[PDB]
PDB file of C-alpha atoms and ligand atoms in Angstrom:
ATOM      1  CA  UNK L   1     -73.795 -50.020 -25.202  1.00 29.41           C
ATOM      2  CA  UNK L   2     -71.238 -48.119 -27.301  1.00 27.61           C
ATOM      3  CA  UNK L   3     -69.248 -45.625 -25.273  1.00 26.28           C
ATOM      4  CA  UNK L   4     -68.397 -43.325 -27.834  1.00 24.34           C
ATOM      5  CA  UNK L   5     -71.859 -43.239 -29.600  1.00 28.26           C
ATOM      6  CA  UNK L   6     -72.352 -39.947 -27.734  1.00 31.31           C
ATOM      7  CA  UNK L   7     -69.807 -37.687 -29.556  1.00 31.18           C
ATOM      8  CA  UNK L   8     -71.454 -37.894 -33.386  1.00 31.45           C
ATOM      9  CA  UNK L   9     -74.956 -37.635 -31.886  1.00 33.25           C
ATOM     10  CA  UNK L  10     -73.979 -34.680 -30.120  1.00 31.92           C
ATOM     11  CA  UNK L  11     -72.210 -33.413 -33.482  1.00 34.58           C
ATOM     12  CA  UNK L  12     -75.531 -33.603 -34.761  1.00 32.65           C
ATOM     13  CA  UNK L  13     -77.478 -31.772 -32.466  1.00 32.25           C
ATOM     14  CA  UNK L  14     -74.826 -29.232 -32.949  1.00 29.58           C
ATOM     15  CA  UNK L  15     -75.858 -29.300 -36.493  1.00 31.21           C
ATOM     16  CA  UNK L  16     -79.721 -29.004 -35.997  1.00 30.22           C
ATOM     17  CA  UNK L  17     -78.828 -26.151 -33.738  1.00 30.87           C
ATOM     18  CA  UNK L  18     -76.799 -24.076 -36.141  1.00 34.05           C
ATOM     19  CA  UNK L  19     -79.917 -24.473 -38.758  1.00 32.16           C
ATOM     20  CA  UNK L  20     -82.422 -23.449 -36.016  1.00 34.56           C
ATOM     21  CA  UNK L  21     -82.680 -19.756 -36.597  1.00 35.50           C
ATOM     22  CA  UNK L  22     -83.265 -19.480 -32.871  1.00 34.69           C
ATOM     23  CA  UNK L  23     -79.398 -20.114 -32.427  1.00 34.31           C
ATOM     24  CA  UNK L  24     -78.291 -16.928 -33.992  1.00 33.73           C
ATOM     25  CA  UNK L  25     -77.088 -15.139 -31.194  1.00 32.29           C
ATOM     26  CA  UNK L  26     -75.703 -17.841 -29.623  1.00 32.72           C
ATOM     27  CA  UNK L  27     -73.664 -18.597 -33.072  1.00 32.08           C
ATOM     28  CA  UNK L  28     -70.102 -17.092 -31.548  1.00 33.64           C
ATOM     29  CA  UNK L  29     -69.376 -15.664 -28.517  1.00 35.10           C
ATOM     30  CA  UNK L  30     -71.017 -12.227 -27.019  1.00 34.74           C
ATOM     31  CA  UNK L  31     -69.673  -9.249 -29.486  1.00 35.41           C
ATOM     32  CA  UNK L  32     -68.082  -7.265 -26.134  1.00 35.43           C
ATOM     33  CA  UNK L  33     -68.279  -3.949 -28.598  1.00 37.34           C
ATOM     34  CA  UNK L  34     -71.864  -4.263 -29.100  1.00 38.67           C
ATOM     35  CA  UNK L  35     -72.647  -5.045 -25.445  1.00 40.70           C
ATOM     36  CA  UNK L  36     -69.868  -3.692 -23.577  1.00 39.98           C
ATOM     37  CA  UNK L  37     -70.751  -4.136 -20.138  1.00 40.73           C
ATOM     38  CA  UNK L  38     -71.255  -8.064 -20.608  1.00 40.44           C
ATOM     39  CA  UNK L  39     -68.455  -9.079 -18.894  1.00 42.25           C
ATOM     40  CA  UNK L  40     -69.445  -7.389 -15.079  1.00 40.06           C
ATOM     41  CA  UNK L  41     -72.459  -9.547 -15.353  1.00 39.12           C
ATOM     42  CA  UNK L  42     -71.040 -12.951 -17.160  1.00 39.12           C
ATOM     43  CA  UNK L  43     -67.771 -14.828 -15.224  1.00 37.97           C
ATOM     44  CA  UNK L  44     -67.782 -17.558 -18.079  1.00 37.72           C
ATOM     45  CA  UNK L  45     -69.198 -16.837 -21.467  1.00 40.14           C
ATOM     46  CA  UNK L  46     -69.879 -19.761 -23.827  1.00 39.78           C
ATOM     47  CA  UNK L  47     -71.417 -20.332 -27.494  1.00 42.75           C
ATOM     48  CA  UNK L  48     -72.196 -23.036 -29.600  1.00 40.18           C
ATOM     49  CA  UNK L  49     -68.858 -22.306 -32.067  1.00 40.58           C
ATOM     50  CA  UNK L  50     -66.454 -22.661 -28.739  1.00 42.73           C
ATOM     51  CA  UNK L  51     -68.949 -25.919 -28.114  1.00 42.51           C
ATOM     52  CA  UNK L  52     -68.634 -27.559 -31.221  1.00 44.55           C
ATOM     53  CA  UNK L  53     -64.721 -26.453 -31.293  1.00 43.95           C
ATOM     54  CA  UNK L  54     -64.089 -28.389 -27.922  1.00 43.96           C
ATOM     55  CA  UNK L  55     -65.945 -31.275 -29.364  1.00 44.99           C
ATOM     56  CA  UNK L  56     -64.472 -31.512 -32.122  1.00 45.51           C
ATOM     57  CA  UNK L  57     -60.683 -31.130 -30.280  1.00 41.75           C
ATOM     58  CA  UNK L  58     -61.652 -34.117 -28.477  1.00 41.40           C
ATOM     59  CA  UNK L  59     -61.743 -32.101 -25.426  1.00 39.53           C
ATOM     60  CA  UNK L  60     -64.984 -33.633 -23.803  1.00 35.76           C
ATOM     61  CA  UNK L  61     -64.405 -36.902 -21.811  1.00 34.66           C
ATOM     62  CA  UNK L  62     -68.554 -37.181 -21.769  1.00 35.88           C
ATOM     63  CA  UNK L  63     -72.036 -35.732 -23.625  1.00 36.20           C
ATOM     64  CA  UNK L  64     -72.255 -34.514 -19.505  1.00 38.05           C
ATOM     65  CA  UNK L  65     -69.638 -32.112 -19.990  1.00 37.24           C
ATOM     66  CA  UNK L  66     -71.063 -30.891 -23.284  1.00 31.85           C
ATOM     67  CA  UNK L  67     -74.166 -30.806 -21.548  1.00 30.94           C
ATOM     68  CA  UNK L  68     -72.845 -28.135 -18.571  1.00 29.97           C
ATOM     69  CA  UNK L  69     -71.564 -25.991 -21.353  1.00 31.89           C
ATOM     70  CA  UNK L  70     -74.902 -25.708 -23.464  1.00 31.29           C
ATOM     71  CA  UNK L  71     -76.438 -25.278 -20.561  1.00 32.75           C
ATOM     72  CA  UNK L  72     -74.480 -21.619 -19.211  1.00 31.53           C
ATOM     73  CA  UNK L  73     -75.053 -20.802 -23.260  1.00 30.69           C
ATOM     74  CA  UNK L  74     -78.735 -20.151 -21.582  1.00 30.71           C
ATOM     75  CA  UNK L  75     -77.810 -19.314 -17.934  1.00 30.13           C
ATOM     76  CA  UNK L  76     -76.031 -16.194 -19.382  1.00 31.88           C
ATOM     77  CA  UNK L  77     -79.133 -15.830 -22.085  1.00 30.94           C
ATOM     78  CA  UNK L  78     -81.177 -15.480 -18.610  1.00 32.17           C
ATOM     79  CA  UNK L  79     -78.792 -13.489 -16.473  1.00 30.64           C
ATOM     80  CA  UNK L  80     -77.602 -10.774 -19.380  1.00 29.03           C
ATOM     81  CA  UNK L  81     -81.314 -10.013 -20.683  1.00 30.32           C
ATOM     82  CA  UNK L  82     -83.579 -11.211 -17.894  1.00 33.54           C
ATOM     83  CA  UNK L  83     -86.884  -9.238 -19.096  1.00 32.12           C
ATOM     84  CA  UNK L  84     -88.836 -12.542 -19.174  1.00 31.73           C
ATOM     85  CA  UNK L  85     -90.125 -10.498 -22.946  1.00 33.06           C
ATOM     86  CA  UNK L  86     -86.995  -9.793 -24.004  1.00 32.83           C
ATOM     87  CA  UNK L  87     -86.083 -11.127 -28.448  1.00 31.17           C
ATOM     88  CA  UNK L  88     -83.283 -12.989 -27.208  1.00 31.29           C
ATOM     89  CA  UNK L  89     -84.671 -14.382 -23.990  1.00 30.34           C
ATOM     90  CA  UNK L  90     -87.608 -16.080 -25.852  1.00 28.32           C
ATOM     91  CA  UNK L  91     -85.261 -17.768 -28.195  1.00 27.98           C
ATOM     92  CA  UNK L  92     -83.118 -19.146 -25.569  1.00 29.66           C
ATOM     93  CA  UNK L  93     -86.262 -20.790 -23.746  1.00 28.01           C
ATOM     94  CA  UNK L  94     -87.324 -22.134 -27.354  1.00 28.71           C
ATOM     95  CA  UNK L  95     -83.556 -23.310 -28.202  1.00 27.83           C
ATOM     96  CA  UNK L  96     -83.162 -25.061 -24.569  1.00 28.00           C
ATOM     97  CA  UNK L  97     -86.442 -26.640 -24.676  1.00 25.76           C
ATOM     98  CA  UNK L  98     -85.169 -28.254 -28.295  1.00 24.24           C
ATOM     99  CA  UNK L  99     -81.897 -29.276 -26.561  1.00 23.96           C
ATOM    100  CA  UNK L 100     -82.979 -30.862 -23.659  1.00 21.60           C
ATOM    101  CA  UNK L 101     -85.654 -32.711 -25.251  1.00 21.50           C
ATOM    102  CA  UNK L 102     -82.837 -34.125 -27.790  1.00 20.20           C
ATOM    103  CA  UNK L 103     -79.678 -34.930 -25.203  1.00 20.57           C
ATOM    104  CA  UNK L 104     -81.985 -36.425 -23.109  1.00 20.74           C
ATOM    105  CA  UNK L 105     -81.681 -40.154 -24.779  1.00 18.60           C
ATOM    106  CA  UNK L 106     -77.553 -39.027 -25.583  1.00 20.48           C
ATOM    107  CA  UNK L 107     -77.103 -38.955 -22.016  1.00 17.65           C
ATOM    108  CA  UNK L 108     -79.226 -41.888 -21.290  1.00 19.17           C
ATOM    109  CA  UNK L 109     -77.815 -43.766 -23.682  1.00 18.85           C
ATOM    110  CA  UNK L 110     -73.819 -42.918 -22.221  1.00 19.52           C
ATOM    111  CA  UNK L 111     -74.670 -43.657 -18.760  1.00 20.55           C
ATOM    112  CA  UNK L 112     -76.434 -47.222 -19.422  1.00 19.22           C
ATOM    113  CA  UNK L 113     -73.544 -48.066 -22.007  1.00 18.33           C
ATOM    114  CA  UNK L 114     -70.684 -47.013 -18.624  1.00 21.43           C
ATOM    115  CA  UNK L 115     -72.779 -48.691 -16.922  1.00 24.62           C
ATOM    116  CA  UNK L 116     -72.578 -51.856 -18.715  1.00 25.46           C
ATOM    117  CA  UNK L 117     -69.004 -51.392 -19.034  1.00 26.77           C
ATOM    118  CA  UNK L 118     -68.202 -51.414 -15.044  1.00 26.99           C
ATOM    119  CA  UNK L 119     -71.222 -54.280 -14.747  1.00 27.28           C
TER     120      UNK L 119
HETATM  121  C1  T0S F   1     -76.303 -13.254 -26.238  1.00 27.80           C
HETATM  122  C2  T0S F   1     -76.565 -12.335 -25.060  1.00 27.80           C
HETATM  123  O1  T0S F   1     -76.836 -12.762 -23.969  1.00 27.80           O
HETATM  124  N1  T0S F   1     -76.621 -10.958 -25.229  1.00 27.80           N
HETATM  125  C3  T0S F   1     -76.592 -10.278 -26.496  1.00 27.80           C
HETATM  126  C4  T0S F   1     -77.997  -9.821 -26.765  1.00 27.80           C
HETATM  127  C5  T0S F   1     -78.618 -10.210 -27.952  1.00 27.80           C
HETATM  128  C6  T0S F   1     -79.949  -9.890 -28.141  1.00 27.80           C
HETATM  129  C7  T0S F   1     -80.699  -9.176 -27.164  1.00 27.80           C
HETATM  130  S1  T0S F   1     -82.370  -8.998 -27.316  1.00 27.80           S
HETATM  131  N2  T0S F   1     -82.929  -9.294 -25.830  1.00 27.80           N
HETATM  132  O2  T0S F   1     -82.676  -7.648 -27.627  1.00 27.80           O
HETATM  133  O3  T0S F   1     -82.859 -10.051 -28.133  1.00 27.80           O
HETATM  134  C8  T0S F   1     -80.030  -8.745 -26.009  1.00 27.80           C
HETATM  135  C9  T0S F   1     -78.689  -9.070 -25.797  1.00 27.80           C
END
């Protein structure tokens, strides 16, 4: 039931995800030179450095909000290169599957330890 548990597991996720070589172009934001019409197709972009930096600033409140970031990381993946055969849209299927099998006990464990809190 510890309420801050969340924020050094997530750390290290973030860590298995930077070794994963499936998280290379995900490493730091979209290089607008080398694809230069990225922003008429992506309103928020978002990478695992600006992740880990807003961790890290203490600038999540919960692994939820984390969670919503890493999560447009891939909506973007799908809605910048959507050829279901495309190099980077395989990793970001292979990467998300990886995340969302490992937050899934982070944010199980948050919500019980909340709700034990407000019990
Ligand atoms: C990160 C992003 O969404 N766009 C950059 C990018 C990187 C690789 C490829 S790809 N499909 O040739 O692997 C296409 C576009």
């Amino acid at each position: 039931y510890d309420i801050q548990a969340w924020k050094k597991q997530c750390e290290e996720l973030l860590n298995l995800i930077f070794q994963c070589e499936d998280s290379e172009p995900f490493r730091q934001p979209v290089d607008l030179l080398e694809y230069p019409d990225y922003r008429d197709i992506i309103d928020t972009p978002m990478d695992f450095a600006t992740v880990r930096e807003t961790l890290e600033a203490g600038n999540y409140e919960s692994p939820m909000e984390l969670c919503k970031d890493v999560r447009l990381i891939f909506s973007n993946s799908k809605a910048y290169t959507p050829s279901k055969r495309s190099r980077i849209y395989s990793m970001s299927l292979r990467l998300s599957a990886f995340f969302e099998e490992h937050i899934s006990s982070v944010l199980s464990d948050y919500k019980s330890a909340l709700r034990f809190h407000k019990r």
